[PDB]
Design a protein around this ligand. Structure first.
Ligand code: AN2
Ligand code: AN2
Ligand code: MG
Ligand code: MG
Lengths: 355, 355
C-alpha cells in the first residue's frame, strides 16, 4: 500500500508521496505488480499526463518516517482534473488515503468508487499545523525550511536569508490559496483560525484573466513583471500633490487601487501588463495589511505566509516583506517556507498511523 | 463675503455654503452686486453647469451659525472640473476660503490665482471629526443624523432606524472615499488615524468600469442591482460541497472573490451585471472585514461609515450592517449618517472664526 497524503483545495490538489528506499530482498519479492508499477511511474516521470507535476527540487531524501527510511515527494495537479486521477485509479489494483482540504468532503463519494480504498478525512487545520511543524523539524535536507528577506526596505541590500524556527510559538500562519485563511498557533496542541479574507490567489488569477486575458498563473506573473501598476493606481501624490506628512503617508503609496481607471482616457492607455501588476500589487498589499492587523490583535510578531499564491512569485513575497517591516517599524517579520504549498498534504500523510 | 467650507478629495469636491436668512434692510442695501449674484445663483439652481449638484434634501434650515441664522447647503462636483470652478471664480468679484482634503494642498497655487482670496488649509482629520460631531449635535432638522439597520441579519424584518449619538465616544469612523481611512475617536480633542486601505470607492468604480464599461457611479450601482455575484465568486459550498461546520463558515459565504473567473467557460458566460455586483460585494465585504478588525483592536463597538461610496448605495450599507452584526455576534454596530459625504466640508467651514 503506497503511502500518500492529499490536500484537495479549491484550485489545486497537492499530494505527498513517501517512497521507501530500504526495500529489502523479500519485500520486493512479489510486491504486487501494480505497486511496483505505481512506484516506477511516479519516480520515472516529472510530468503526469497533461497537468500533473512533480516538484523535484522540493524532494526530501533519506527521511525516516514510520520506521522506514525513504524519500518524500511533492506532486500537484488542478482540482479540475481530479476526475481523471480517480478514473485512472480505477484502472489497476489496496490503499488507505488520508485526505484534507474542502475537496476531501466534496469528492468523498467519488474516491469511494475505488473499491480497494478507505478514505480518512482529516481537518485542514490539524494537517497544516502538523505538516508545517514537521517539515521545519526535519529541515530541507539540512538547510533551513524557513527564510525571510533581510533589510526588506532597501532593494540594494535586500536578500533571502534562512530563519530559525526551533521554538516556533507563537506563530501567525497566513495561508494564501484560492481564498486566505489566517491561523494563530500558540502551541502544538493550541491553535485557532483567527479570520480570513476572500481576496486571495483566485481573486488575483480571476481578475487578471478578466482584465488581461491571460490563460495561466505563470503567464499572469510574467505579465505583471513587465508592468507599471502606477498607471492603474491613484497614488498619494496624485491627491495631495506630494506626501501626506501629518500621517506619514509617502507620495508613492497607493491611495486608491485601480483608482485612475475611473478616467476613460487612462483606461484607454493602460496596458495589459500594467493591469496584471496592479492586480498583483492590490491583492498582495491587502493581504499584508490584513496580516498586520491580525498579528497586532493576536500579539504575535512572526507571520508565516504559505499557500501556492506565492510559488514562483518573488514580487509578492518582497511586497509582503516590505509592507510588514515598514508599517510595524520592524516589529513584524514576514516569514516564508520552501514547501509552502504542501503542508496540508504532509500533515494528512502523518495522520496515517491513527488508522 | 460668502461663507464656504470646501473638501477637495481625490474624486469629488464637496462644498458647504451657509446662506444668511436674517439679512436686514441695511445689510442688503448695497451688498456688493457680485455677492447678491452668487447667492441668487446658488439658491435658484440645483444643477450648476454640467457636473455640479446641490443635494437639496440634505439642506439644514434655520441653523444658528456664528451668531447669524441661516441655511446650510451641500453641493458637490468632480475634482476633475475644479479648474472650471476656479476659472469662473476669476470672473466677478472678497472671500476667505477654508479648505481641507488633499486637493487643498495640490491646488493651493491655483486658488491663489483668485486675487481677492485667502486660502486657509485645514487638516482633514480635525475637519471630519469636528464636522461629524457638529451635524449630529444640531440634528437633521429635528431628525436623527445617525441611523442603523435593525435586525440586519433578517431581510424580512431589517429596516433603517435612528440611532442616538449624544455621547459619541468612543467611535470608529470608516471614511470610504477614493481610498479608505479609519479613525478612532476617543474624545473631541483625542483621535487618531488607525489605518486605511487602498481598496475603496475608486477601486469599485475603476474595476467596474474596466470590467463592464459603465460610465458613471450610478450606472455601476444600477448594473450591480441586477446582477448575481455568485456567478463570479467561488463559494464555500463550491469547495466543500456544503458548509464548513468546524469553523462555522456557511456554504453561501464567499471563499474566493472572482474565484470562478479562473475558468474560461465561466468567464465566457458571466454578465456585466454579475461582474458589477461581484465588484461591489468584494470591495464592500473587504472594508467590513477591515473595519471589524480595527474595532476589535481599538476596543470600540460603534463603527460609523461615511464618505460617498455609500451615497444612494443601499446594497453596500446592508452588506456592511449584516457583516458586522454576523461576525461579531451582535457586539458590533454598523452606523450610518445622512450627511456622510460632507463632514469634511462642514468642519472646514467651522474653522472660519480662527482666521
Ligand atoms: N499551476 C497553478 N495553477 C493554478 N493556480 C496556481 C498555480 N500556481 C500557483 N497558483 C496560485 O495558487 C493559488 C492556489 O493556491 P493553493 O494553496 O493550492 O489553494 P487551494 N485553495 O487550491 O488549496 C491559485 O489561486 C493561484 O493564485
Ligand atoms: N457622482 C459620483 N461621481 C464619482 N464618484 C462617486 C459619485 N457618487 C458616489 N461616488 C463614489 O464616492 C467615491 C468618492 O467618495 P468621496 O468621499 O467624495 O472621496 P474623495 N477621495 O473624493 O474625497 C467614489 O469613489 C465613488 O465610489
Ligand atoms: Mg488550500
Ligand atoms: Mg475624502
Amino acid at each position: 500500500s503506497p503511502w500518500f497524503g492529499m490536500d484537495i483545495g479549491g484550485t489545486l490538489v497537492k499530494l505527498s508521496y513517501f517512497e521507501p528506499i530500504d526495500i529489502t530482498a523479500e519485500e520486493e519479492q512479489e510486491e504486487v505488480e501494480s505497486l511496483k508499477s505505481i512506484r516506477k511511474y511516479l519516480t520515472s516521470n516529472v510530468a503526469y499526463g497533461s497537468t500533473g507535476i512533480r516538484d523535484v527540487h522540493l524532494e526530501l531524501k533519506d527521511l525516516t518516517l514510520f520506521g522506514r527510511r525513504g524519500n518524500l515527494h511533492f506532486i500537484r495537479f488542478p482540482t479540475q482534473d481530479l476526475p481523471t486521477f480517480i478514473q485512472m485509479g480505477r484502472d489497476k489494483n489496496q490503499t488507505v488515503l488520508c485526505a484534507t482540504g474542502g475537496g476531501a468532503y466534496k469528492f468523498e463519494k467519488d474516491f469511494r468508487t475505488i473499491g480497494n480504498l478507505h478514505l480518512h478525512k482529516l481537518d485542514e487545520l490539524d494537517c497544516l499545523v502538523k505538516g508545517l511543524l514537521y517539515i521545519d523539524s526535519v529541515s530541507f535536507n539540512g538547510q533551513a525550511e524557513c527564510y525571510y528577506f533581510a533589510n526588506a526596505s532597501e532593494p540594494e541590500r535586500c536578500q533571502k536569508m534562512p530563519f530559525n524556527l526551533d521554538d516556533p510559538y507563537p506563530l501567525l500562519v497566513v495561508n494564501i490559496g484560492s481564498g486566505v485563511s489566517i491561523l494563530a498557533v500558540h502551541s502544538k496542541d493550541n491553535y485557532k483560525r483567527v479570520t480570513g479574507t476572500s481576496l486571495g490567489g483566485g481573486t488575483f488569477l480571476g481578475l487578471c484573466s478578466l482584465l488581461t486575458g491571460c490563460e495561466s498563473f505563470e503567464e499572469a506573473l510574467e505579465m505583471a513583471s513587465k508592468g507599471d501598476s502606477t498607471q492603474a493606481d491613484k497614488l498619494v501624490r496624485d491627491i495631495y500633490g506630494g506626501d501626506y506628512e501629518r500621517f506619514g503617508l509617502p507620495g508613492w503609496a497607493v491611495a486608491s487601487s485601480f483608482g485612475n481607471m475611473i478616467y476613460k482616457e487612462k483606461r484607454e492607455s493602460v496596458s495589459k501588463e500594467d493591469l496584471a501588476r496592479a492586480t498583483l500589487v492590490t491583492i498582495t498589499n491587502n493581504i499584508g495589511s490584513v496580516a498586520r492587523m491580525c498579528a497586532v490583535n493576536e500579539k504575535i510578531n512572526r507571520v508565516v505566509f504559505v499557500g501556492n499564491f506565492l510559488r514562483v512569485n518573488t514580487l509578492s513575497m518582497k511586497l509582503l516583506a516590505y509592507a510588514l517591516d515598514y508599517w510595524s517599524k520592524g516589529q513584524l517579520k514576514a516569514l516564508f517556507l520552501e514547501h509552502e504549498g504542501y503542508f496540508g498534504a504532509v500533515g494528512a500523510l502523518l495522520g496515517l498511523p491513527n488508522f
